[PDB]
Amino acid sequence: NPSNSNLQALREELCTPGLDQGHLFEGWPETVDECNERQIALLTDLYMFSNMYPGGVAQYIRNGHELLARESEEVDFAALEMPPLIFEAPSLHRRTAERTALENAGTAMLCKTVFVLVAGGLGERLGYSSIKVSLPVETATNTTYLAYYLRWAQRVGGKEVPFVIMTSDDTHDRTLQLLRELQLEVPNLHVLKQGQVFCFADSAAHLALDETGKLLRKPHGHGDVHSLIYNATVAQPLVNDWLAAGYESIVFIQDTNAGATITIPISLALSAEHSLDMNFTCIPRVPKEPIGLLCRTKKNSGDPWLVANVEYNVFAEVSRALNKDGFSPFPGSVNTLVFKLSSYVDRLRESHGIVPEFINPKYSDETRRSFKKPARIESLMQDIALLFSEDDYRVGGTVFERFSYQPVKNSLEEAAGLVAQGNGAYCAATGEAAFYELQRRRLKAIGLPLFYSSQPEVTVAKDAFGVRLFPIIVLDTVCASSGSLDDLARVFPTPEKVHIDQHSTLIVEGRVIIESLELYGALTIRGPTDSMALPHVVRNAVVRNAGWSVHAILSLCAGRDSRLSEVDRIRGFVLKKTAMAVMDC
Ligand SMILES: O=c1ccn([C@@H]2O[C@H](COP(=O)(O)OP(=O)(O)OP(=O)(O)O)[C@@H](O)[C@H]2O)c(=O)[nH]1
């Protein structure tokens, strides 16, 4: 593509004061012609960066200088306080008139919602070699996070629901593989792959090389999602297609928080009720939490207030210097972002989806100033809130119960350490446990008589903590529709005649109505896969069998003829699916 002369001009340019990338061409011949294919390739790699980053590599270096100087300084705001527009959501396990109104209002709005899934990470930090959306939400059905989100979206928004997945070099191919393998048919899905950015070996922003001598690359952060969307087409801009088709909201979700399918309808309803352009999904936060705080900020004493997320580390540092006259006052943002689409698009078009950047290098020492590993510039998807002036827009937050926040983000060992400090585990074990409990709390809210012990049923991480799983009740999207309390009530029309023992397992797939049941064991009930077909009705059912059990993965663990996978090891237990009754037709 690019010319021999253009590559020469760029090389020369990069060697000028303020750029100083001479180290990249150490011992090269005078002109491009004389350069070998390998050298020609590196210059090409530098050159093509322009169609990936605003201003290309030259501006990247300049930005690096600015940010590196900036981050060497002390972060501080001239003003910081509670956001004006904070709204408390009613409990998810109480079927009050208010909860009902918000759920049904939000559910209608789901019909005009665009969904965006941010999925550019592996679960390595968890102990998981594959993509995080391939993690199961729970091992009873093994439904992946990916299918979980996609089927819900297609349920509430129909088959042609507009859906974006942002991937990366790490997750992209595998994401496409998973889509194919699960036979997911999503006509209006757009998979947008973020590009990695160059790295700085040092504080002078000298570009880093890898082991082969090629330019080193690292992720630019989830902030890329806005740029990717701004540049996506269907020759018509993606966002224009959405707008013209009548879509009115857009929501952004993380890769392993199943709670989003519960919070979203509520947030949508509240966004409409309080005319919110941007609505941060929040929870009350404990000061000892790697979660950001939603704050009304003012960077300089002359600026306007901005409503935006303030990262935990920053808020810590910020506080000690400028104190001016059991959770944090400010809400904790879980990064489920809800927008009025028209407002989002306006800001998008104005900024080209570019959001403020930062750099956060890891040093070898406090004093030696040397990097431990090459740094790169990053961006956060939530920082788009900075483009929404308080004069033109209403940016606020909705506060939910902490229980509705169920990320799978820590390894078993990390969770052990965390639990000891009295903090949340947020590992695969507690994620799975929380999902089962969530179903139970929702079901009880409509009158299902679920009596079960709160005692843990298995201990993980060398006996560090326990979780319980049973009773296990999982209804698919054809059965439970949107998951609203009203939708659940359709499955259980006369709840008081349904008696699910605390040790039982109930799996429901398809169009099923359960009127009366006594279950002591494991049961799967299957109905029509078509949401519009006549339902399989269960009445006067009695099922007794050995059902399922759970036990910890033993420390002894090693050995051939083994069936333990990473999925098992990252949660520290295994379901034994001993027996299972099936009711079809
Ligand atoms: O460059 C990135 C970084 C993060 N993310 C998205 O970050 C959410 C939170 O990302 P975090 O930054 O909070 O965690 P992480 O990336 O270290 O690990 P993952 O979450 O990727 O597993 C997930 O949606 C993650 O895929 C991206 O999509 N791209």
**Phi, psi angle pair for 283, to nearest 5°:** -140, 155
- Which residue has a Cα nearest atom 21 of ligand 1? 121
Q: Give the span between the Cα atoms of 39 and 290, in whole angstroms.
A: 43
Q: Whose CA is nearest to atom 8 of ligand 1?
A: 254
The experimental method is X-ray
Tell me the three state secondary structure of residue 195. Answer: coil
Between CA 37 and CA 31 the distance in angstroms is: 13
d(CA 222, ligand 1 centre) in Å: 6
Residue of minimum CA distance from atom 20 in ligand 1: 121
Q: Which residues are annotated as a binding site for UDP-alpha-D-glucose?
A: 118, 120-121, 194, 221-222, 254-255, 292, 311-312, 333, 382, 405, 409
Residue nearest to atom 16 of ligand 1 (CA): 121
Gap from CA of 6 to ligand 1 centroid (Å): 36
Q: CB of 472 within 8 A of CB of 452?
A: no
DSSP 470-539: PSEEEE-HHHHTT--HHHHHHH-SSGGGEEE-TT-EEEEESSEEE--EEEESEEEEE--SSTTSPPEEE-
Instruction: Report the distance separating Cα 297 and Cα 289, nearest Å.
Output: 20
Q: Edge to edge, what strands does the sheet with 541-544 contain?
A: 498-500, 517-520, 541-544
The token pair at 208 is 């880093």
Which residue has a Cα nearest atom 18 of ligand 1?
Answer: 121
Which of 334, 472, 458, 471 has its CA nearest to residue 403?
334
**Cβ contact 426:407 at 8 Å:** yes
Q: How far is the CA of 308 from the centre of ligand 1 (A)?
A: 19
**CB atoms near residue 350 (< 10 Å):** 10
Residue of 167, 222, 427 to test ligand 1 pocket, by largest number of atoms within 8 Å of CB: 222
* Ligand 1 atom index nearest CA of 171: 26
353: left (phi over 0), alpha (psi -120 to 50) or beta: left
Q: Which residue puts its alpha carbon closest to atom 19 of ligand 1? A: 121
Query: How many Å lie between the centroid of ligand 1 and the Cα of residue 254?
Result: 7
- Which residue among 118, 167, 169 is best mutated to probe the pocket of ligand 1, counting the most ligand atoms within 8 A of its Cβ? 118
The pair of structure tokens assigned to 289 is: 């939490």
Q: Residue 368 contacts by C-beta under 8 Å, 6 or more apart in sequence?
A: none
CATH architecture of 448-585: 3 Solenoid (2.160)
Contact of 308 with 293, CB cutoff 8 Å: no
Q: Which atom of ligand 1 lies closest to the CA of 253?
A: 24
Chain breaks in the chain (C to N over 2.5 A) after: 234, 325
Helix (H) or strand (E) holding 178: helix 172-181
Q: What does the alpha-carbon distance between residue 162 and residue 511 come to, in Å, rounded to a whole number?
A: 25
Closest CA to 381 of 259, 191, 285, 252: 252
Can you read off the two tokens belonging to residue 452? 């079960």
User: Which atom of ligand 1 sits closest to the CA of residue 168?
Assistant: 29
- What is the per-residue DSSP string for 422-450? T----BHHHHHHHHHHHHHHHHHHTT---
Which atom, in ligand 1's list, is nearest to the CA of 219? 1
Residue ranges for the binding site?
118, 120-121, 132, 194, 221-222, 254-255, 292, 311-312, 333, 382, 405, 409
For residue 114, give every residue at least 6 positions away whose Cβ sits within 8 Å of its Cβ, in sequence order, or none.
162, 163, 164, 242, 247, 249, 250, 251, 341
Strands 517-520, 498-500: parallel, antiparallel or unpaired by DSSP? parallel
552 CA to middle of ligand 1, Å? Answer: 29
Count other Cβ atoms within 10 Å, centred on residue 107.
21
Q: Note the Cα 28 to chain centre separation in Å.
A: 45
User: Is residue 312 a contact partner of residue 293, using CB atoms and an 8 Å limit?
Assistant: yes
Give Cβ neighbours of residue 241 (< 8 Å, ≥ 6 apart): 234
At a CB cut-off of 8 Å and minimum separation 6, what does 506 contact?
471, 472, 473, 474, 500, 519, 522, 523, 525
| Distance of alpha carbon 47 from alpha carbon 402, whole angstroms | 47
Substitution site in 166, 254, 333 for ligand 1 pocket (most atoms within 8 Å of beta carbon): 254
Q: Taking a C-beta distance cutoff of 8 angstroms, is the pair 509, 525 a contact?
A: yes
Q: Tell me how far the alpha carbon of residue 363 lies from the centroid of ligand 1, in angstroms.
A: 22
Ligand 1 centroid to 467 CA: how many Å? 26
Q: Which of 255, 336, 377 to mutate to test the pocket of ligand 1 (most atoms within 8 A of CB)?
A: 255
Give binding residues for UTP as ranges.
118, 120, 132, 194, 255
Whether 133 and 146 have beta carbons less than 8 Å apart is answered as yes
Question: Would you say 136 and 184 are in contact if contact means Cβ atoms under 8 Å apart?
Answer: no
Torsion of CA 150, 332, 131, 165, to 10 degrees: 40
How many angstroms is it from 119 CA to the middle of ligand 1?
A: 7
The CA distance from 118 to 69, in Å, is 30
Indicate which residue's Cα is closest to atom 15 of ligand 1. 121
Whole-angstrom distance, CA of residue 577 vs CA of residue 569: 17
Q: Which CATH architecture has domain 1-447?
A: Alpha-Beta Complex (3.90)
Q: How far is the CA of 74 from the centre of ligand 1 (A)?
A: 26
Residue ranges lining ligand 1, Cβ < 6 Å: 118-121, 132, 166, 168, 219, 221-222, 254-255
Residue 383 CA, ligand 1 centroid: distance in Å: 14
